[PDB]
Design a protein around this nucleic acid. Structure first.
Lengths: 98, 341, 233
RNA sequence: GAGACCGAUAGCGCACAAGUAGAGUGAUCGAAAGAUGAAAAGCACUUUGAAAAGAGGGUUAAAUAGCACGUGAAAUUGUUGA
RNA sequence: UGAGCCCGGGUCGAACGGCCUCUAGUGCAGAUCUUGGUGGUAGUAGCAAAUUUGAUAGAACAAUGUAGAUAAGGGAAGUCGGCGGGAAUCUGCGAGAUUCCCACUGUCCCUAUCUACUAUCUAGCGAAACCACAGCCAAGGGAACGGGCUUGGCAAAAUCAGCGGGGAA
RNA sequence: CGAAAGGGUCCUGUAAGCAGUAGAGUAGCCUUGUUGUUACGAUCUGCUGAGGGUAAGCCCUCCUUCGCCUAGAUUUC
């Protein structure tokens, strides 16, 4: 989940900002070395601010188009039922004329 | 579009069916009606026009001409047709012994994994003095048949193509009595026939091919069986001459193949037919040449052609060097050639 | 696991580097693109965007500086890491074959990748000097172990086992040594003396590597360890 | 204490967790849902395998009575056969 | 005759029937009927709400175009426009000599730029509207009523993609 | 046959680097120079018809090289 990855990376930046400067750089070298280790082993880590934000933006856009597709289809179905009742009342009035 | 050519259908067969042959009368001498080659490409020629009454009379005229590589074809069979109230129908066919590997590849579909058994019992029937049956079939053809066709195959092993399967076709024998044409075919068995033998100089013919399928950008657009009529053979080249593209006007010893070879085809070493104008089909494709059904009605036919030269600059670019000799002479010496030497 | 060898790192290429890269590709067969023809207008972006859909996991880049120094950049697609080795001494496969009394031509063995053998690299802590061991050497081991496909001794056909790739470290676990990387290639010949004798024949190329520098990404990222330049905190 | 009453879509909304579960800001609205077997004797044990699942084997008068359980129609579905 | 009744075969396990009367909450195809269950549509549409936050999984791809805009170019049309700048040519740096264009429009199109909209496959999940039964064509079929029927033309399984024919004032 | 090479053929335009007082000029140093010299300097001259590419839908090689071989799954009188 991109949201879960965002939460994890937010916790990561809070920890980085809380720890002191010399060991900012020390632990930073540490997770870079380990990052290279598991990613070279093959574990594709997913930690990039722009990439995750743009993935979330794509998901939100997909949801928006889907909601619009709802509104169109639902309005069409309601229109169909309304029309059916409309000619039913039409034909009842025709019978009353007859 | 024209209603005679719609709906747009794919060509059922990649070869191309001849359908109609010229009408037969017994009075002419015997002759085959068809031949096959492969579209190699086209070049440019300039010609001293000999059309009286034309604006460009006795002037240089530049034309585009198709080259068809035409290796000698081998006669491997005769067929006898009988006329019936339901049309013509195959009465009986006779084959030849020692059928070629390539015609056997035509008879087969998966040649690499099949043990070569086709026509083996037929060759045995020839070999074991069933000449009784052989002469029986020939006598049946002579007695009951009115139309005879020679089965002839063209030879990829001489053509410069990655293909290895031969090309077969039936070619009618006209101009003579049925017995005469059957004897002529019987003589023809197991002998190559040249395009000098089938066709001849400066003459009008018909050409059958399958026009290219324009695929991958209401339906099939392309790959259509087309017989284009009225195309004039201007030249027949010999392969072995090496002065094929050479013309009397320029004594430049070169073959019909331009610098670098034909693009996407190669280099031709055989008999070839050089015909005027654009012609249906593409390169490497089988081209079916045949005689006109009717005697000609224009001076364009029986107009004799005199050539000047044939474009042999590399068609892979905008070259202007006909021969490697003149090219290496004009460019002079280069540093890479000097270092090699 | 697929790897490609490219000369795009150098501004221009010559016969020596071309032969070296051809030999490296021959070593990398069959998991490499032999017909990769480098063009001057190409770039690292084009090559990585080709690696993307091609599923290539590793990329060797042979660069040549204006001074004539040659560098080998081993990068893992498509986001790094990057390892900068410097060329100290190199020999061509043709020269190796000429020097060898009985050179063996490559054959059906092109179908099988070489087994990686790794010597003198220190994985466990011996002096707690973690900066070289626990930062550089483990990454080296993982990088090459991923460069070559994982080897399961319990399923690999011994008759297919024909090539070996040697990586010998001139360095001691006490962080004392010349820190030199020795890359070599050998062909296996099995002779019946079951007792079988294994004879290894040089195939080349011989490679003298200086572990110069490292990057997190594809030719990008912070310098994690540079031998000559240590950045302050 | 009784009935020429109804017998689980009936009879009170409720034969059973029923004004329960649930909805609504709120006044209020408000269901569905019974039966193994005489007695759990509710399948020991072996063997598949990630399961609300099988093959043996056992209990019972009967398990195609196995807590999906008194009997088990039609709609609909599958295999075999014509 | 009929609504119905009796028996044979299987299942099944606790009550039931014939006749005379008495009684009634007593007989279903419809009610866009009630409840419950189950179909075609359909493994289709599409991944959309539902099923400590939220969340289909791989492969791909980066294109194709569309709408709305721009004190940009070109072409076209109409007029009462055309008879300093740019583009060139000739000649021996030459005041060097000579040739072409510049307008406006409440007019049309294209190309250039901006904003916005756009994306496929395989796996997994997976509805809804609608449904008396089904759809070749021609003429006839009194009541501008045809899918029934008559006479003909004919008529060969099953898929994907285009396509056009029917459904009084 | 199908992976390098070689040759052919087209394409672009004369590669890096080196050597030229060639280079509008600029700032110093000496016995002051009719190739003064040291540093910077777009750009011009020779190596250099150079360099590089050339099949993914261009040709030809005598082994130019090297490799691959009678498979394996179903169906049909």
């Amino acid at each position: 989940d991109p949201k879960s990855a965002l939460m994890q990376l937010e916790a990561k930046k809070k920890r980085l900002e809380a720890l002191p400067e010399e060991k900012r750089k020390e632990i930073e070298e540490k997770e870079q070395w380990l990052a290279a280790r598991r990613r070279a082993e093959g574990i594709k880590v997913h930690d990039d601010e722009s990439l995750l934000k743009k993935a979330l933006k794509r998901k939100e856009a997909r949801k928006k188009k889907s909601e619009r597709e709802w509104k169109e289809r639902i309005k069409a179905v309601e229109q169909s039922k309304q029309e059916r009742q409309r000619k039913r009342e039409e034909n009842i009035r025709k019978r009353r004329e007859e | 579009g024209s209603l005679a050519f719609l709906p747009r259908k794919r060509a059922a067969r990649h070869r191309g069916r001849v359908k109609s042959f010229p009408k037969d009368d017994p009075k002419k001498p015997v002759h085959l009606t068809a031949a096959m080659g492969y579209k190699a490409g086209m070049t440019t020629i300039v010609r001293d026009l000999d059309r009286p009454g034309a604006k460009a009379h006795k002037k240089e005229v530049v034309e585009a001409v198709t080259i068809i590589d035409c290796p000698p074809m081998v006669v491997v069979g005769l067929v006898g047709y009988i006329e019936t109230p339901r049309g013509l129908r195959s009465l009986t066919t006779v084959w030849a012994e020692h059928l070629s590997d390539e015609v056997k590849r035509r008879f087969y579909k998966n040649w690499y994994k099949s043990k070569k058994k086709a026509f083996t019992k037929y060759a045995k029937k020839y070999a074991e003095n069933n000449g009784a049956s052989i002469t029986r079939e020939l006598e049946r053809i002579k007695k009951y048949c009115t139309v005879v066709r020679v089965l002839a195959h063209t030879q990829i092993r001489k053509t410069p193509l990655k293909q290895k399967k031969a090309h077969l076709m039936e070619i009618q024998i006209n101009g003579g009595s049925v017995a005469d044409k059957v004897e002529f075919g019987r003589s023809l068995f197991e002998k190559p026939v040249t395009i000098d033998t089938i066709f001849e100089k400066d003459e009008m013919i018909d050409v059958i091919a399958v026009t290219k399928g324009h695929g991958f950008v209401a339906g099939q657009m392309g790959y259509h069986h087309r017989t284009s009529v009225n195309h004039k053979i201007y030249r027949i080249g010999k392969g072995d001459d090496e002065a094929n593209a050479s013309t009397e006007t320029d004594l430049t010893k070169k073959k019909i193949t331009p610098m670098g070879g034909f693009v996407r085809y190669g280099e031709v070493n055989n008999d070839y037919v050089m015909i005027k104008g654009s012609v249906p089909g593409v390169k490497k494709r089988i081209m079916t040449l045949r005689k006109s059904l009717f005697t000609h009605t224009s001076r364009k036919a029986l107009e004799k052609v005199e050539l000047k030269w044939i474009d042999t600059s590399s068609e892979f670019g905008h070259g202007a060097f006909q021969t490697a000799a003149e090219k290496k002479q004009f460019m002079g010496t280069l540093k890479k050639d000097l270092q090699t030497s | 696991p697929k790897s490609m060898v490219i000369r795009i790192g150098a501004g221009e290429v010559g016969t020596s580097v071309s032969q070296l890269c051809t030999d490296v590709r021959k070593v990398m067969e069959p998991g490499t693109a032999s017909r990769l023809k480098e063009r001057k207008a190409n770039r690292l972006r084009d090559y990585v965007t080709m690696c993307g859909p091609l599923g290539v996991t590793h990329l060797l880049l042979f660069s040549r500086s204006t001074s004539g120094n040659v560098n080998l950049r081993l990068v893992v697609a498509p986001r790094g890491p990057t390892f900068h080795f410097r060329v100290e001494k190199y020999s061509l496969t043709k020269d190796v074959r000429r020097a060898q009394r009985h050179p063996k031509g490559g054959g059906k063995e092109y179908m099988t990748p070489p087994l990686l053998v790794m010597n003198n690299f220190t994985d466990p802590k011996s002096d707690a000097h973690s900066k070289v061991p626990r930062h550089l050497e483990s990454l080296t081991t993982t990088a090459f172990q991923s460069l070559f496909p994982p080897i399961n001794p319990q399923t690999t056909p011994l008759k297919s086992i024909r090539r070996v790739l040697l990586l010998n470290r001139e360095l001691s676990p006490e962080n004392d040594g010349k820190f030199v990387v020795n890359f070599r290639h050998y062909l296996i010949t099995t002779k019946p003396v079951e007792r079988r004798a294994v004879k290894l024949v040089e195939l080349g190329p011989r490679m003298r590597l200086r572990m110069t520098k490292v990057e997190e990404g594809l030719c990008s990222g912070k310098v994690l360890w540079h031998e000559y330049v240590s950045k302050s905190k």
